[PDB]
């Protein structure tokens, strides 16, 4: 996240960390959410790769035991039957990893409110992103928690030639785009917080940003527009 604060314990507590077994040890290399107490949402672009995933959560230091985190390995990896890795244009980038077990929900595991199939934002709408992602193109994963306010762009807006064009699909969110403020590297598949009702819910799953760089002037981050996906996501979750 780059343009991010830091944020705090117990504010995001649905946020889970995608991590791969680099040999010796386990190394973030996503955000996801947890949607049950067995199952997670996050970005198929994040599990393209056959490697050996588990899921932490209750982090908040990566590199520092907070005393708060759970270890859970993922025993099964279900990505949408039209993701094609070569085509994160074309969308789809949304996948549920059903873990080995059950965690343990208090003030620091909590589920992530889903919201109401077909649900599209306002311009403008109040949102944030949270990750360990790079906090400068091309730098480095923050070691604790960040998030940052990022509003939504429309689709009307998003699709226009001075911002993303027709790389972003209706199936899409974009947040963002003021140059200073982004996701970046390490935040994918990991949610996108919008206040509607007074309760914050998860529409986005961040997908991709500009390969020019991550905070960039009218490149917004694109998410996977969470309402498209609700009947998918229920109709795997129930098949399992």
């Known amino acids: 996240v780059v343009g991010g604060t830091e944020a705090q314990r117990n504010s995001w507590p649905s946020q889970i960390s995608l991590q791969y077994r680099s040999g010796s040890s386990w190394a973030h290399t996503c955000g996801g959410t947890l949607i049950r107490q067995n199952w997670v949402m996050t970005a198929a672009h994040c599990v393209d790769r056959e490697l ?5 959560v209750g982090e908040h230091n990566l590199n520092q035991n907070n005393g708060t985190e759970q270890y859970v390995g993922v025993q099964k990896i279900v990505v949408h039957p039209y993701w094609n890795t070569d085509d994160v244009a074309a969308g789809y980038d949304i996948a549920l990893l059903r873990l080995a077990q059950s965690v343990t929900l208090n003030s620091y595991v909590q589920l992530g409110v889903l919201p109401r199939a077909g649900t599209i934002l306002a311009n403008n709408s109040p949102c944030y992103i949270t990750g360990w992602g790079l ?9 604790t928690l960040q998030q940052a306010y990022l ?8 699709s226009s030639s001075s911002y993303w064009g027709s790389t972003v699909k209706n199936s899409m ?31 986005g799953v961040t997908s991709f940003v500009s ?16 309402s498209a996906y609700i009947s998918w996501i229920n109709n795997v979750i129930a098949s399992n």
């Open 52 to 56: 050996t995933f588990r899921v932490v």
């Open 135 to 143: 906090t400068r193109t091309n730098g480095q994963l923050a070691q």
């Open 151 to 158: 509003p939504t762009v429309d689709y009307a807006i998003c």
């Open 173 to 203: 969110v974009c947040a963002g785009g003021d140059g200073v403020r982004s996701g970046c590297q390490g935040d994918s598949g990991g949610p996108l917080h919008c206040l509607v009702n007074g309760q914050y819910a998860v529409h």
């Open 211 to 226: 390969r020019l760089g991550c905070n960039v002037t009218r490149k917004p981050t694109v998410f996977t527009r969470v």
